Design a protein around this ligand. Structure first.
Ligand code: 9WG
Length: 291
């Protein structure tokens, strides 16, 4: 099928937040692309909003380039450069075990991606391994951030007025990586994207989280059980046996005030100092490169 005169639509290759992913080719450029399709008439249309966020994010390191946006037949279409597997696919491919060097190489880039989105007045709100993809070819060392479907402006683009403190909010994101504030129903802000990343890094270290795979009757009761398990698990217990930096990272995120600008530099330097004490080289040789 033809997409915006220039793109050739192929078979389905993946599943996305509110629209499936298809293989494509930019016929004029001779380059493969990923095409996200969303039904023109749906009770919850979100592709168009997401496109605007990606467009605002353009030029940022690890921000996927959007080649085209439009409407074709029964669908709203978004065309992105082709990327590699997500950190979840790579984690499963690596038998759910990442070396400390891989976790630290990933932590460095992931903190930067989040800082970039924040510099562009947005909070991601769904920080999880599935939303970070590795690039391909010459970009194979680069971690990309995707899925702006739950992203929200946290401050006014010009005035920098932070959004007001709100309570009794709905769990926006994934329960496994949600911050304690989110479980409490507090409006998400910059600190919450970073706390989620802290749980993602501990998840890479452990293979799973202590509140993962809890037995429950309803999805709301599962969230209550996860909340309870997260609030009953001290950071030192969660991080036992791993370098103290992971715990320091999580304690710092939990200490942040609602409208505080996080010290991203300090957080990257925490892991960089550990990376150097370990004698590792920033050579971008991840565990999967040794397979
Ligand atoms: C298998 N692949 C490769 C590949 N490359 C690039 C992005 C994705 C991809 C994965 N998800 C969950 N969403 C997207 C996507 C997003 C916006 C778009 F405009 C197009 C695609 C994939 C993919 O699913």
């Amino acid at each position: 099928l033809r997409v915006g005169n220039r793109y050739r639509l192929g078979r389905k290759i993946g599943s996305g937040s509110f629209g499936d992913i298809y293989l494509g080719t930019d016929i004029a450029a001779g380059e493969e692309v990923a095409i996200k399709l969303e039904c023109v008439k749906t009770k919850h249309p979100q592709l168009h909003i997401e496109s605007k966020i990606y467009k605002m994010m353009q030029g940022g390191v690890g921000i996927p380039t959007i080649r085209w946006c439009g409407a074709e037949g029964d669908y709203n279409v978004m065309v992105m450069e082709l990327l590699g597997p997500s950190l979840e696919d790579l984690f499963n491919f690596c038998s759910r075990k990442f070396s400390l060097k891989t976790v630290l190489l990933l932590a460095d880039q992931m903190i930067s991606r989040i800082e970039y989105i924040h510099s562009k007045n947005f909070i991601h709100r769904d920080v999880k391994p599935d939303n970070f993809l590795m690039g391909l070819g010459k970009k194979g060392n680069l971690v990309y951030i995707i899925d702006f479907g739950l992203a929200k402006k946290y401050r006014d683009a010009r005035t920098h007025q932070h959004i007001p403190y709100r309570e009794n909010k709905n769990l926006t994101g994934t329960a496994r990586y949600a911050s304690i504030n989110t479980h409490l129903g507090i409006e998400q802000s910059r600190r919450d994207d970073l706390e989620s990343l802290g749980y993602v890094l501990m998840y890479f270290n452990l293979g799973s989280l202590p509140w993962q795979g809890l037995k429950a009757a309803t999805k709301r009761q599962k969230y209550e059980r996860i909340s309870e398990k997260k609030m009953s698990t001290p950071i030192e217990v969660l991080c036992k046996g791993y370098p103290s930096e992971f715990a320091t990272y999580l304690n710092f995120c939990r200490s942040l005030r609602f409208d505080d600008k996080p010290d991203y530099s300090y957080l990257r330097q925490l892991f960089r100092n550990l990376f150097h004490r370990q004698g590792f080289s920033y050579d971008y040789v991840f565990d999967w490169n040794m397979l």
